[PDB]
Structures are given as structure tokens and as C-alpha cells.
């Protein structure tokens, strides 16, 4: 996982809804809502920051060579295809399909949520209760373009584009250099080039079959998505707590009580809902720290497994690391480690 869902909270809308008396009473707190929003804004900025570190390592977009003559190695499966409206690879298409986001987009109009759909759509309830989801700065197409540039640099130049000034090299010679790096003489690469290319193609096809089957194997990103959705839905559900007040609905209290009597009930509700928001923001901060650690690890792996050949054991797969290929995935990166 690289990034998590960016969220914003309108504390006045969550705590008080459309009640003016509750808003006036909540004005006495003031700074806590600003603190919560500052923490959420920091998390939201850190999400795009993590994505930029993971995928924008190279600022020089190399696009795919046309010849695609790589000594029997077949990369048309992890390279993007122009037929698809989105310039993403077929394996990237599978990874996109196997992760289901909470919402199709980030724009939900009032008319869509108007009526009985508000009470049945979770996103509609979240938005009506002041909870908004902010889209990432980088679109999936842009992340796919970054992944394609990294793949083209790795295939055509090898490790040189990671140190700047991408130097072209035939792919067989690059594989021979990597074989020398893992301690095997390069002639073994050349005397078994057909076998090695066939084995790599077969492994890519095995990844094909594994991803296209019913098995998910992408539970790490789905867990992040589900955690964010569950946090938002729990925030919505916690509005039914009385918090010691006669009712959990401000409208009932305002309808049956005068200003003085309703003031204590509204204060109890405000305290409870502020505590709920604070708990949500603290959990979001902890999860953002974990996601930042994961994104730092992903950036390190992209630097050391994709931009070069790593000699660290089990850092870029099991076995003697030869190379790695990045693939974009919803809220994450998938590393294909050829060892």
C-alpha cells in the first residue's frame, strides 16, 4: 500500500447538522475543529507526497520503443496497450479490477443523493453528515504513465536511467550483466538465452493466471479501502448515541425543550460528537503513519529493485534478485520480482 483515502470533516455539519442553536453553542469550542481539520489536511497532503515519492522517482517520461525486440523476452504484457482507453498494462487492468473502491468517482451531485437514496447510500449519508473524500492529486492514468516510464527505462536502459542519462543497451547484455551481478558467469546467460526467456514468459503467464482467477491475493489494498470506509461509516453510525442526553437528535431536544433546558443536552451531544471526531482523527493519524512507512518501503524497493539490482537478501523477492517491474494498483504498487 502506498496511499490511503484523503478525508475532510465539516465539524459544524457533523456535530450540529443544520441547527443554528447548536452552531452557536459549538462556537465556544472553535479550536478543536481547526485542530482536527489541520491533522486531516496533513494526512491528505502526506498521501499525495507518498504517491509522488513512490511513482515520481524519475522525472523523465520514457515511452515504449516500437520494435520490441528484447532477445525473446516478452514485455507486451506489463507494457501499456494503446487499445485500452487508459494507457495501462493488462496486468494493471487486472489489479484495477480486483480492488473495489468505495465510490466510482469523487463527485456525487445533490440530485443523486436527493430523496430515499440518502438513507440507503453510505456515501450520501457521509456527505450529508459533513464527511468528504478528496481525490488524489495523481490520477490512475498519471500513475500508469509513471509506471510505464519506469518500465521503459528498465527495459531499454537497465540500471543507468536510475543514475541519470539513460544509456541504451541490448536486453540480452543487460541480463548478462545481472547474471554477473548474482555471481553467475554471463556465458550461462547466453548459452541458455532461449530457456531463460521462455521461463520468464512462463512466469509472467503464471502471474496472468493467478491474477485472472477467483483468488484475490490483493488483500492489502482492499484492507486499506475497507478500513477507511469502515471508519467513515462508524463515524456516521455514532451520531445515534445519546451521550447521556435525553435524545440523540437535536431536533427533538429543540422541539420539546427551551433554550436553557436544551443547552445542557446540546452540550452533551456536542461533547460526544467532538470525542467521536477526535477518535476518528487519531485513528486516521495512526493509519497514516503506517501507510507512510509502507510507502517509504515501496519507494526504497522501487529505487533498489527497479532502478538497480539489489544484493540484499529477500528484499526484492526470494532468490538471487535479477530485476523488478513496477505496476500501478489502486492505492498501491505491485512489484514483479524476477529472481
Amino acid at each position: 500500500p502506498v496511499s490511503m483515502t484523503k478525508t475532510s470533516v465539516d465539524c459544524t455539519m457533523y456535530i450540529c447538522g443544520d441547527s443554528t442553536e447548536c452552531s452557536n453553542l459549538l462556537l465556544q469550542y472553535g479550536s478543536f475543529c481547526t485542530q482536527l481539520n489541520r491533522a486531516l489536511t496533513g494526512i491528505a497532503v502526506e498521501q499525495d507526497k507518498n504517491t509522488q515519492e513512490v511513482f515520481a522517482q524519475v522525472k523523465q517520461i520514457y515511452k515504449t520503443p516500437p520494435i520490441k525486440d528484447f532477445g525473446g523476452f516478452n514485455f507486451s504484457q506489463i507494457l501499456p496497450d494503446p487499445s485500452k482507453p487508459s494507457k495501462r498494462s493488462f496486468i494493471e487492468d487486472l489489479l484495477f479490477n480486483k480492488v473495489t473502491l468505495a465510490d466510482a468517482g469523487f463527485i456525487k451531485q445533490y440530485g443523486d443523493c436527493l430523496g430515499d437514496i440518502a438513507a440507503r447510500d453510505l456515501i450520501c449519508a457521509q456527505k450529508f453528515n459533513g464527511l468528504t473524500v478528496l481525490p488524489p492529486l495523481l490520477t490512475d492514468e498519471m500513475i500508469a504513465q509513471y509506471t510505464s516510464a519506469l518500465l521503459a527505462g528498465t527495459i531499454t536502459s537497465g540500471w543507468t536511467f536510475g543514475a541519470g542519462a539513460a544509456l541504451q543497451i541490448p536486453f540480452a547484455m543487460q541480463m548478462a550483466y545481472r547474471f554477473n551481478g548474482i555471481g553467475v558467469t554471463q556465458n550461462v546467460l547466453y548459452e541458455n538465452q532461449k530457456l531463460i526467456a521462455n521461463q520468464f514468459n512462463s512466469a509472467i503467464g503464471k502471474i496472468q493466471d493467478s491474477l485472472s482467477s477467483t483468488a484475490s491475493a490483493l488483500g492489502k489494498l482492499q484492507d486499506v479501502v475497507n478500513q477507511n470506509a469502515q471508519a467513515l461509516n462508524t463515524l456516521v453510525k455514532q451520531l445515534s448515541s445519546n451521550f447521556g442526553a435525553i435524545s440523540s437528535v437535536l431536533n427533538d431536544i429543540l422541539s420539546r425543550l427551551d433554550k436553557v433546558e436544551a443547552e445542557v443536552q446540546i452540550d452533551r451531544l456536542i461533547t460526544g460528537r467532538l470525542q467521536s471526531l477526535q477518535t476518528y482523527v487519531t485513528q486516521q493519524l495512526i493509519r497514516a503513519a503506517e501507510i507512510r512507512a509502507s510507502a517509504n518501503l515501496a519507494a526504497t524497493k522501487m529505487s533498489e529493485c527497479v532502478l538497480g539490482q539489489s544484493k540484499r537478501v529477500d528484499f526484492c523477492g526470494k532468490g538471487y534478485h535479477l530485476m523488478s517491474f513496477p505496476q500501478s494498483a489502486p492505492h498501491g504498487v505491485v512489484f514483479l520480482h524476477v529472481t
Partner: protein, 411 residues
């Protein structure tokens, strides 16, 4: 509230704003009109039958009368009725005119002046224990007034009785009218009064010359429920027309709120008046007049962001409505420049077909920058330079020189 830039200034608690994009409050929609929907009832509530009754019941045999299908206009009691005690528990008195009451019951009896304090949810004493007990969660109003001019006789009025010597305390709203002889001692009675066997009922004195603590007091306890069931007793509030598909303040059977009312497909059961969602909020209501189900939707909806180049640079701002086509719109102000990026309608920013580095991240691949007549320009950010590696199966690139580069890392 002058403009979203001023709202950003207030949120940041400063008169200067740095360059960037700031989330503001969600798009608010103010109600246009106020509507009241009560069932059409014209008959006044039987205030004369309750507070003007010729005879009242004894406290041990307190009378309970149902109140239904009437208007609770208690101001008619202002002319002739004076009350020493009027205490409401589940509802503020000043709200009684704006509410509808579900299950109205009037419990009438006569007690001593000193025992009026015992008519409360958590009181002890003779009346509270053996005659009339209120529940701990009692919702309603207790009314008591001196009736010495009516319930007192020169020779002594002994027609009002109270229960003494009960085996156990009464349950809330429980009536005991038995006349079995109470056994105080170990010797068991056989229906005869004597020694430790006493008749459980004793009559008040109630003479005109008695002290204020021993003068008769008429007590009426009104018990009801609020804002949970259809209800048929309402205050003296005139109903208005039903306004749909518009942000209005509404008063449905005493339940007040703000929202948009639309026709609903929900089929309420006959005993149901309100519908509630997972958050316990009233999201559906049955119209007391047309008996139709209406969905209630909050007026405010949609996130708003303000893009500014910095107040030190310019006062121009752009507004991003994160849940809107620039297809009236749900926008605070619209004019000239609308782009309709992903992440919402953008108003006040120019759009160009070129790509540059991100300056102010709008989102979804869109960025903003204050550029030249200076103005805010929205563009699709560039991922970087594009080139081709001259790949071939027999061509290599080898460096003929090198650069010694020193870079700084801050941790």
C-alpha cells in the same frame, strides 16, 4: 460569510492567507419558508370537564380520563383557573403550544395541601407510597390548586379518602381500591377491625378553618408521549400548506426541523408516524392531513474549496465545488470561467491546454497557478519530459565523461 476567501481567513484566524487550496464549510442552503403540519382538529380540549369538574375522586381511587382529538389551548384557563402548582417534567412549558401529544391521560384527585409535594416522580410519603405513584421517567405536567371553597364543609367534608396501612408500595400509575383489613401485628385479622387490625382507608377533615396544609387541593396529572407516535392532541398552532422539493423549515406534529420534503415510496404501518435512519434522525414522516409519506433530506451538501495565490499577491480566488457539474447550480457564485474538472466545478479560474508543473494542487490531475493581466489558470499538470531511448539489439551507450555531483539531504 462575505465570501469564501473571508471564510478561509476566519478559519485560519488571520488576515493574511498563503498560496494554496483550503477546505471551507460545506455548501449551505438556507430554508426559504416555514410550514406547520398538524391534523385538522377544531374541538377544544375538555378543560371544563377536567379542571371545572363538580366532584373529584379520592386519591386512593384517582380518576383517569382519556384526552383525544382536541386542541390543547390552555390559555382558556387563564380567565378563571388559578394554579398553585404547575410543574412539567418531560417538556418545557413554553414549548407546549408548539407540540402534539400522543397518549394524553388526565389523572384527577384531591389531597392535602402538604401532600402536593408528594406528586413527583421520586417522592416518598403516604400518598406517594400507598395512593398514587408517578414513574421515574414520567413525561407530563402536574397541576395542583387549592379547592377550599369547593371541597370543604363547615361540619367537615369526609367524602375524600386516602389509603393508609398498605402492605407494600404502589407501582407507578397503579390503583388500589381494596378495603381489606390491614394486619399490623402478628395476630391475623378475620375481617374485623381491632387492636392491630385497621381499616386501610381514612377520610380527610377538610374544614374551611383548616390550615393551608390541611386544606383540600385538586390535582390533575397530565401524562403523554412526544414525537414518537401519530398523536391526536395538538397545541393551538395553525397549519400551513405543504411545500415539497424545496428547503423549508417544517413542524410535523410538534417535531421541528429543516430540510427538503419529497414524495416517498415508504409504506408506513398504521401505528407509525415517523421514520428514522441508522443515525436515529427523522428521515421520513407521515403527513397528518394528507396521510402521505414524505422523505426529508438535509439541505446542506457538497464540499467547497478555495484556491488562492496568497493575499500578499492578489485578492482573486477560485472556488471548487467538489460535487457538481458546471452543466440553478449549487454554487455560491458563478461567472464567466467554469471548467468542470474532475473533483468538481471550478469557478473563477482560466483553463489552458498546456501542461506545467503543479503549483496549487486542485486534484485529479488538475493544478492551479497565478500567471499572466494576472489571473488564476487551471491546467493538467505535466509528469515530466518525454523522450525515447534509442534501443537496439546491437547498440550501446557508454559515457565518455562524468560529473561529480554533491547533493544535500535533510533529515
Amino acid at each position: 460569510a462575505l465570501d469564501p476567501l473571508s471564510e478561509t481567513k476566519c478559519t485560519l484566524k488571520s488576515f493574511t492567507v498563503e498560496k494554496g487550496i483550503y477546505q471551507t464549510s460545506n455548501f449551505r442552503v438556507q430554508p426559504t419558508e416555514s410550514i406547520v403540519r398538524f391534523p385538522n382538529i377544531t374541538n377544544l380540549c375538555p378543560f371544563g370537564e377536567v379542571f371545572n369538574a363538580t366532584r373529584f375522586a379520592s386519591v386512593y381511587a384517582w380518576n383517569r380520563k382519556r384526552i383525544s382529538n382536541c386542541v390543547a389551548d390552555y390559555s382558556v384557563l387563564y380567565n378563571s383557573a388559578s394554579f398553585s402548582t404547575f410543574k412539567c417534567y418531560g417538556v418545557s412549558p413554553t414549548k407546549l403550544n408548539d407540540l402534539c401529544f400522543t397518549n394524553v391521560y388526565a389523572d384527577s384527585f384531591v389531597i392535602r395541601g402538604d401532600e402536593v409535594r408528594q406528586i413527583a416522580p421520586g417522592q416518598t410519603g403516604k400518598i406517594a407510597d400507598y395512593n398514587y405513584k408517578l414513574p421515574d421517567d414520567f413525561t407530563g405536567c402536574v397541576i395542583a390548586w387549592n379547592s377550599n371553597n369547593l371541597d370543604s364543609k363547615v361540619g367537615g367534608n369526609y367524602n375524600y379518602l386516602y389509603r393508609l396501612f398498605r402492605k407494600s408500595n404502589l407501582k407507578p400509575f397503579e390503583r388500589d381500591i381494596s378495603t381489606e383489613i390491614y394486619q399490623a401485628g402478628s395476630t391475623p385479622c378475620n375481617g374485623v377491625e381491632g387492636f392491630n387490625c385497621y381499616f386501610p382507608l381514612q377520610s380527610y377533615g377538610f374544614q374551611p378553618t383548616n390550615g393551608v396544609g390541611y386544606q383540600p387541593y385538586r390535582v390533575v396529572v397530565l401524562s403523554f408521549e412526544l414525537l414518537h407516535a401519530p398523536a391526536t392532541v395538538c397545541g393551538p398552532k395553525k397549519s400551513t400548506n405543504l411545500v415539497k422539493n424545496k428547503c423549508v423549515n417544517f413542524n410535523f406534529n410538534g417535531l421541528t426541523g429543516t430540510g427538503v420534503l419529497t414524495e416517498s415510496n415508504k409504506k408506513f404501518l398504521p401505528f407509525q408516524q415517523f421514520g428514522r435512519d441508522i443515525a436515529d434522525t427523522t428521515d421520513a414522516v407521515r403527513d397528518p392531513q394528507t396521510l402521505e409519506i414524505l422523505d426529508i433530506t438535509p439541505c446542506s451538501f457538497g464540499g467547497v474549496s478555495v484556491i488562492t495565490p496568497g493575499t500578499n499577491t492578489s485578492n482573486q480566488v477560485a472556488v471548487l465545488y467538489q460535487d457538481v457539474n458546471c452543466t440553478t447550480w449549487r454554487v455560491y457564485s458563478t461567472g464567466s470561467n467554469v471548467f468542470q474538472t474532475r473533483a468538481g466545478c471550478l469557478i473563477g479560474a482560466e483553463h489552458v491546454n498546456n501542461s506545467y508543473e503543479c503549483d496549487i494542487p486542485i486534484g485529479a490531475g488538475i493544478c492551479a497557478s497565478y500567471q499572466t493581466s494576472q489571473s488564476i489558470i487551471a491546467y493538467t499538470m505535466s509528469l515530466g519530459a518525454e523522450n525515447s531511448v534509442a534501443y537496439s539489439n546491437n547498440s550501446i551507450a557508454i559515457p565518455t565523461n562524468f560529473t561529480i555531483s554533491v547533493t544535500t539531504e535533510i533529515l
